Symmetry: C5
Subunit: 207 residues, 5 copies
């Protein structure tokens, strides 16, 4: 087997419009943003324009193959794959995807998709010019699928919060915490899971 | 059966360009805006930029299936279903759809589609910097289907207007009231139903 | 024959890239702008930004069906139909179509398409703050089909011109005249028919 | 008698959109003539100008020819069904906003005419715009991928008025226009690339 | 023998655009080189530049080759028919605005050449732009999803020097472009993604 065959096989088995629920359990999607830049910020309107990599991780076993004597990874367009309907609940602009819309697929079915996204949010900018900084909280979860259908978690890998953050930003990152949360709506007993990324940041220059 | 089979079936039955009209009566489409944010008001131009979750419900019986031994619900792309051709009559920009464009379909035939839309309107902004606030009126209904094909009725419930409104907005919501109406034109015989949403709001933290 | 059948047959019989020309005679397209709003205006650059419903009407007899025991009108996507190739000759922006891209098809062959269009034009803005107002003239006609192939005609539909105009606009309409015309060029004899729409308007100098 | 439908279907089945209609080995003779409709948002500091123009573009594909003895002489055809020359403005700094329907005109002798109204920004000499001598903005346009052996671009010597189709309502006026032919070559590679250099000479209307 | 239409037909039959053309299990040697055309907006406070550049991209796809001994040895081909490297600018803050026809140039041996003019905004060091020694804006471009065992990027150590196609009408000027190679790795996984780093040394002209 070879890469042509892997991609060919994916076309035959993949159903992009059908959630790949193994049996009757939810598809566990691991979500994790890595902040790259903070471009525009508004102290009055409480809005921030941000650039970030949204590391996304789920499993789809229909796409699996034997990588005994063939590659165990390929890049595949997201248009050929089911992708989770993640939305940011406090975004006030369409997510601007800056990178090639290709997911990485492993022989064992586990998918990895990490687009760099510029997007504008509505969050608490208060304190941004102080030295304890502002805390902008972003809530990201499935727009249409609930607990039983999709579950969302953070990678919970504590490390360098400003590893890939631009040194040429006007701001700097103090902390980033990523917390699981089980939001529910007033219409219906239907709990939607979301990951709450708290971005603690301040403007550079101090006195 | 499974979710794969349900969607397969739905593709075969559903006709996206065919309004699923029950014999010879209008399709009942309910509409309900839930305002999330108010971004850029301009009292001079009488223009406001708004974010809202447009909760839309209707029945397409042709989508139905037996859910005894199968899931009762699935998310389906809006391109695989018929969707009401709703437009805001006083919009001055295309609706920017922020969320994934999937609808929610139940085996009983009812569709639920609630996108988060950002849009700019022309409406009465005067009074935004006052106690009583400005009242922005947004009229929404079918662009091509008249009252015999689409009837719109606002799912009105005096519960909580700012339930999902952002606390960090410059503005605060005083009141929202959704009201059914019906527009006719001196050109033509057809009447087009609509929902007027009166958004009464003002700036937070004014002098008293 | 239910709605599905009408619509099905329309898709089977429609020829989007072929003008439904009756014999030698042209296609009688009728066009009528109904001004909804005027948003931005500049007297220095002579540039207006205008919203208007472009009521467009023509006949394609191939689509006709017997509507004695059937629906007599249906809503159809304009990507399925032939559509007159209209252009605003003094436009300076691609027309932003704000409404759903659906036309109305009648069983006798008549097609009605009335999109709401926001568009930027180049025209006389001199006046505008005065009592007389300013007359912005807008020419709309076919881009590639001349008199013999496409004819344009304003629908002389007596209506006060502010019927659908926004009361919350910063400007107001004085008078709107929709005059038929026919522009011709220096390369070729080909004469192209246009509607010359005269928008006499001014700023609401309040009191 | 062949009707328009028959003419189109012939074109579709024999026109190869992604194949240059080379006649044996000789280059396809494209003709490019810009007609200027307006000049907008000028800037002498940054050296940049929005310009609207009709880009009259003519070439020929004789495989498309038919007998118009008792049938229409021309048809309008979408450009997606045709091969269209891959012209680009070399000093453009925004992608071209095509304002008009993307229909070409095919003539029964195989001749093809495409003339869109394009609104596009350029980097060029804007110095002198508020002087009587004016500024001279040069726009180079030619095939992005096909060399002289494959595509030749010719400026149409018409000798007409330069401000013929130009908007009288612009802030600026045209003094003179000259469409010269040029042969751009690159440091890396041998094969030469033809272009038309259009020198637009324009000045700000003396409002006094 | 074979015409251009025959060459193009064969390409669409052999070319699989979503499959990296790894000969053996070597990485694909994608070579990347920017050639700067303009610098339009610069902001020293926010560290953001709006640059226009040609992105000379070159690689081998041997599943495209053909016998050109009695046929043309090159063709222009739309990139949607070819596999194209998934190159991204790591510190780009806007999508790449491709200003030119999206056609690549394929040679009979399998060599593909794609040189799009692109306008794009970057987050980089603008400090000193108005000084004599200027600013140094570093742009990092490499594959987005393929690691070093799949795509290897490399600057064509071929100058070409190097304000050659840079607009003389720009507000700024180039002092030095240098294009060295790099190999970034991450904390997630042990696989290195090659990139090219283009240091643009520029400054506002002024006078002296
Ligand atoms: C830039 N950071 C990356 N990985 N990382 O672990 O941070 N890039 C590799 C990938 C990019 N897209 C997919 Cl899918 S994997
Ligand atoms: C935020 N409110 C939601 N549901 N709710 O019932 O309130 N979201 C779930 C869905 C959103 N769109 C569709 Cl369709 S289901
Ligand atoms: C909403 N206003 C309408 N007419 N009007 O005269 O105002 N609708 C009728 C139609 C609109 N578009 C098509 Cl097609 S039929
Ligand atoms: C706007 N000027 C035109 N002709 N002219 O000669 O000036 N229009 C007619 C055509 C437009 N596109 C094609 Cl093809 S023929
Ligand atoms: C403007 N520079 C060019 N080449 N160059 O090597 O400098 N143009 C020719 C090409 C443009 N796109 C392809 Cl592919 S070949």
């Amino acid at each position: 087997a070879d890469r042509a065959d892997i991609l060919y096989n994916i076309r035959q088995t993949s159903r992009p419009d059908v959630i790949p629920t193994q049996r009757d359990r939810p598809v566990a999607v691991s979500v994790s943003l890595k902040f790259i830049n903070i471009l525009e910020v508004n102290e009055i309107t409480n809005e921030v324009d941000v650039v970030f990599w949204q590391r996304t991780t789920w499993s789809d076993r229909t796409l699996a193959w034997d990588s005994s004597h063939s590659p165990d990874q390929v890049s595949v367009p997201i248009s050929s794959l089911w992708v989770p309907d993640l939305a940011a609940y406090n975004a006030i602009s369409k997510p601007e995807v800056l990178t090639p819309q290709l997911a990485r697929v492993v022989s064992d079915g586990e998918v990895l998709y990490m687009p760099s996204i510029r997007q504008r949010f509505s969050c608490d900018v208060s304190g941004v010019d102080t030295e304890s900084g502002a805390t902008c909280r972003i809530k990201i979860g499935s727009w249409t699928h609930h607990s039983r259908e999709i579950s969302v978690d953070p990678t919970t890998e504590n490390s360098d919060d400003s590893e890939y953050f631009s040194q040429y930003s006007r701001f700097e990152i103090l902390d980033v915490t990523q917390k699981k949360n089980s939001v529910t709506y007033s219409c219906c007993p239907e709990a939607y899971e979301d990951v709450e990324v708290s971005l603690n940041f301040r403007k550079k220059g101090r006195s």
